[model samples]
Target chain A: MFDFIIDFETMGSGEKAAVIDLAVIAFDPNPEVVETFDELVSRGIKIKFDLKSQKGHRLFTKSTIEWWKNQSPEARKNIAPSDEDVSTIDGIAKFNDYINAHNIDPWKSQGWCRGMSFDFPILVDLIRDIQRLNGVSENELDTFKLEPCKFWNQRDIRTRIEALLLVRDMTTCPLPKGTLDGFVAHDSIHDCAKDILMMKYALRYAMGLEDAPSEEECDPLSLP
Target chain B: MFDFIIDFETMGSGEKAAVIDLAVIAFDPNPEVVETFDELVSRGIKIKFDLKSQKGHRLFTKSTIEWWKNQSPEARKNIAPSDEDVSTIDGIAKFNDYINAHNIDPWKSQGWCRGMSFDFPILVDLIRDIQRLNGVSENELDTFKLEPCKFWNQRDIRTRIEALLLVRDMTTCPLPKGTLDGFVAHDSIHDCAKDILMMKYALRYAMGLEDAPSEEECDPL
Candidate 1:
């Protein structure tokens, strides 16, 4: 069985809101094997201005735009549309394919997100919107619903980190430095990677295979 | 001559940052011909983590991710990657192809963006990064440098809208909604469409072809 860690970048907070970026990593605990899936989705609607109000209105909220202006250059750059981004419906369908390719059995293993309240609910909403856009009856697509794992089988990274902190200091879990620079904080892939790394470290510590790395030995490229 | 209105969705605020989404609409004010080009780019970097921080790290920032969460489902869905999304280098090459296909001349017409301070600089940076990533020297790829218009001939949507608003209220510059719901903001394609629509309305108003639509006539659908 395998567990998956998922992450998303979105344009709204509602359950049925739009998803801008998504990433998932399927990992086996003991063998420590991992596979990743990620995508940046297009926000199909255009921004319409409330000409009378002299205000620009959009499906995305003003606060979100303001917040986006403050992101790292790398994060903003990757999500920017190029030929790489896909239509919403296409992305959702591809995600279903990715899950199947990985042989994921959501009910048997765990599916994780940074928070139970955010990514999971947003995914449900995304699936709903994609289905609605495709003119598919909601119930007809029930099998493809993002039910990657049982609600009870869902996992949260924050809780796991908190539990890890009881034994290891925060500094002990240094960010993985690669041949180039260290990973940024908002990249969905990196976010998922970090979560998976933490899980591995925690599991190893629990298994007594090895202790968490000290800061000096934390370079990921050098890790076994 | 055609002028292109461009927009972008990025993970960061800098010029060299990674681009996740892009949209450009080529419009001619006089003959009324328009064309569009858009895509999402794949970041080639592999994600790494700082397990100790428990805080997920990426090449992007936390604020951007949080901000993306507030966008419309449609906007978000479009930029997500699929088979259509290309690598950064491939995307740049395609943009060049798009310009060539339209027979655009940078010296003769204008290429507009929301702000010179934002989209223009960011685009320059994006090209630079794509080149660097592909190991293409700066001088070798000068043609793909987003010079759709001469530096002095570049245009800004904010300036045009401000000029237009002097004669008409914002209500006059409504989006062109089709049978479906109107496009959302932050969507580069929709953003470009709205800008083009705004320009069309402003030009019509200037020519006194017709009056701005009253609120009653503003059904976006």
Candidate 2:
């Protein structure tokens, strides 16, 4: 149904990129359905993965850290090492439990992210690398078992936003009106909540409840 | 601009699949801009490629040919070998010239098809194979010089149809009302023409000019 969406933050690029912050939530993308930002965020979780385990196993690039430092201080602080983090084994284990707890089918559910090539690839690679670290084959029922949004079913919200808003040259999407009142850019949960809000706002425009976001209103660089 | 679209038919699956029938065109996806079906088809060309060149290099499976045989006779007729066919080199060369002739910037223009994973991958693979066959490196500007809709920009009209129709369980898009009066299912030109019509029809619904397609109209299987 493409209802389950996952968004993650990384320390760098490539499949082995260190996943610092990760979050997932379910929302009705039909423009006619209405759910407030807070209501949607209530169903999601945001977690920081174990840095020690990730440090040796995943990628951490200097350029990306510099890019992160330039983000809002609130956003920057979200990724700093802390005791709140979970082990790659525990983190992925908890994530799998969370998905089943929410009743999202592991094999049948579809997922969306900002870009399929970005976070999606890293998520799969993390699973594979974790498997290797644990000395388990792909067939094992080990703690590393996590699969959602089979390859062909994955979608990208960035392009969908462009299609809905009828705009080209957009580097990012408009925050649903007043979404910034609560958004903390790059915080996975807030980031996903904001995207679901965009689903609502753009659906409104599609249904003629509101006008298409103004040219200035849609400036891609306006949002972080 | 995403005005450029391309669709093609294959003898089988994979990058080296024999591209039997192909078509391309430009259109305004915005609902407010209107162009008749015939007008869109007029700007496009449908071609069959040189069968001899393709026989050795491309794939052809009995299973796919069996599936093709089951299609409407008119649709099946479109892929039959004929003298009107162009070489893989010539077919692609003509496509390159056609894009330039239409003024779509090779570097900046975006491309669309039913599924980006399907036809788009085969198109790129065909180019690589042609280069290998011609003994040319990727850097060479031989007759194989062609690039449109850089990887990240390719879009699939299939998912967009589902999004716009506000339905998730759809396999094929509804033929815009009255469109089937002229459409033939698998002819590359009509297949593409049908999809462009879908772009317009769905945009109309998005703009509130028409009602959402019915559930009976959107069965996934």
Candidate 3:
């Protein structure tokens, strides 16, 4: 019953964009199986891929770098070089292992992102990258493959929230400014966490619960 | 108020799949505005792209050919060479003109497909193909771009219908085989036409209407 919501902080928005960092959160939407928003965020893992190894293979655009320059300093820190960063193949393998292990039923449970176009396209490209390296690399590299999530199971979080908001009679997706409780915008771990938190809060608001995310300030489309 | 349902029949399912024929249907699901599904299907247009010119650029797969062979003979005729086939760029431009004109508020309305992974991805690929060809070619190809439908508005028919089924207390998408009233399955125009017709029938079925598509034969997957 777990749905994996994946978020990638990329250097570019193109077909060959490289991931700076990517995060995954497992959301079990069943009312009976209760886990608070913060609890869910704690369980999520963020993988920062070593951008140096992705040098010639993946694309980095000047426009995207300029766009990132305008973002919060906290957001800029995510892209900075870290000694803890894993190789390109290892980071992708770790992502595969995380989701594949948690999603008990791949067909029933979905692999999701904010939009269908951006993150998922780059993900499929990464798989092909691994395949090409496998074909001609020196040593026999044992890299993991992304478990096949069927077309029906490949999901979108933004579309579902839009539908939920319509049913809940809410105006916009970003909710109120503090609705996310100051989750860092554009940071991969925080991005996935905010999505699930927003998902829960939207359901809560629909049922007229008072403790739902505050509707005091309505700032729309301010999210990453 | 209006949603455009798009379908593409292709030689292969890959990223570079060459379109065999593509179709579009406009669905206005408002309860007040009444139009039989036949009326909606009649509004649709089908465009077939010339395979000869697409030979070098686009792909044709042996696996897809083998898969199509197992389908009904009625389905095979759609791929056959026709004199009316338009140039690769022109066929896509025709599709752009059709949808861009119909979808009044591009932000509010949606461009939908059976699976989000399938047709919409290819549509975006077609737009990129036009842009690439425009860069290297001699003549300024007056190609029309697909009017930007925002990612939020890029919808999926299968997902909505799946959600509706759970809420409506029903099962199976194909319903009963005969429920589609013998609409040919794979033909591009018929594929899109059946989708709108099915959308109507599903809405009617949810309300427990007696005239809803027959559940006499239950084939639950």
Candidate 4:
């Protein structure tokens, strides 16, 4: 079974929010041959922020812009889709192609994100917009609506992390090496890699794999 | 929340199986103006059951016909989709519209049936075939995939019944009057309706709403 972890950098929150960066990592428990897709998606810009007329406005939010301002320069740059960025339609089509190429059975393969309730649903809405842009037949679009995964197979890494914290200390189970070496907290790809590593440690601890690693072994990155 | 129960009479049992009948009940726990959709789907029958190269065969199943023969005439007729039966594409499209019309949030609403694990997946496969026959684009098809509910929100009445049985006796909680009146066991509509009533009684029993109904009250059909 693989955990297809997805993460997104967006212009706002909620289901209709625009997506700037979308990344997916196909992670298997035993760890070999990783498959990844990272794309900057255009047309996620916020166009309005009125709380009252908001329903009529297709997009835009001031709070997200303010939040983006607080991010590090590199983080901000990475999250902002440039001219080379693909249209939401193309991005989703490519992602779907990637998923098909992997030959994954959504029932057997899991779709996860740190905050699935937030990230996954937003992605679904983005796909809805993509469908419109591509002029997909209304009948077909309604027939096979794009869902991230079956609702039951969908998962939240944040919840799993909280569950793990109940049994062990974060200090005792430091972030995995892949995360420690290349991790950028706000970047979607980095966040996705972190989630994958977290899953590895979570599974190890759950299975009591060869007993907990010593502090030295666990702290490979020596994260304080 | 609503329990959008779906029941499909299929040509066989696997994810690759064909669907002959599709029925849905948009059941609200506190039902007011109950909504329903029932369609006999065409393109469900396969004339050849080629066993030798069956793996490549897109349709056909012998056991399903054998099973159909054992059903009551009414049941058999109900299971068979007729000229009035819409194409699989049209049937699913209407079902999708009905769901959207209800403004049901799949995350909040639930989809259920007697044996969801068996019935639901086959319906999904049939939709796949429908998409192919209709020449649906990959992107469009993926966008509007016909999942009755979120995987987690999907449920099975059989499992719920089993769970209830573990906690309380069925005799102590008889079928609701609605069910006792017009239930036809094999009919999808009746079965779907029965499931809704089952859920009601199960909830009442679980919550200890009142004393179990008297034998006379329970048998009011």
Identify the leading candidate in terms of TM-score.
3
Candidate 4 lDDT tens digits, A1-224 = 44577777666543455567677766664533322312211111221112222234334445576777888887667654355566565667767765655545665565766555446655665565665567864223331235545545555553344333333113223643333654444555555665666655655554446345556556464243
Q: Write the per-residue lDDT of candidate 1 for residues A1-224, one digit (tens) a residue.
A: 66776776765433333456677766664524422212211111121111122122113544455667898897576446555566655666667666666667766766766544456655555455555567864333332335676544555454344333332112124333442135555556665665666555654553346555565756663233
Error of 3 at A181 (Å): 3.9
Local accuracy of candidate 1 as per-residue lDDT tens digits, B1-221:
56566676665433433467566666665523322212211111111112122222213534455667897886577546565566555555666666666647767666666544346655554455555566764333332335565544454454344334342112235433341145455445655665666666655553456565544224331
lDDT, candidates in the order shown: 0.50, 0.65, 0.63, 0.51
Off by over 4 Å in 2: A5-156, A168-171, A176-197, A208-224, B11-18, B30-32, B50-80, B85-87, B106-108, B127-146, B151-153, B169-180, B208-221
lDDT per residue as tens, model 2, A6-54: 8778876444567887898877655667777776788888777866677
Q: Write the per-residue lDDT of candidate 4 for residues B98-216, one digit (tens) a residue.
A: 67765467665666665454556555555555666768643333322356565545554543443333331121235533335533455666556656666556555544563335452
> lDDT score, residue B221, model 4?
28
Model 1 / residue B157 / CA error / Å: 50
Worst lDDT run of 10 residues, candidate 2 chain A, spans: A137-146
**Deviating ranges (above 4 Å) for candidate 3:** A61-63, A136-148, A165-179, A200-224, B29-31, B61-65, B136-148, B167-182, B197-221
List pairs with backbone clashes in candidate 2. Answer: none
Please write out the lDDT profile of model 2 over residues B1-221, one tens digit for every residue: 43677887887644456788778887676677766667777778876687667786676755466778899878788777798988787777777677777756655666777655456656665555556677854333122235655655666675566566656634255544454455555567766776787777776765678665554222211
- Model 2 chain B lDDT-worst window of ten: B137-146
Clashing pairs in 3: none
Sort the candidates on lDDT, descending order: 2, 3, 4, 1
Q: Choose 1 or 2, whichever is better by TM-score.
A: 2
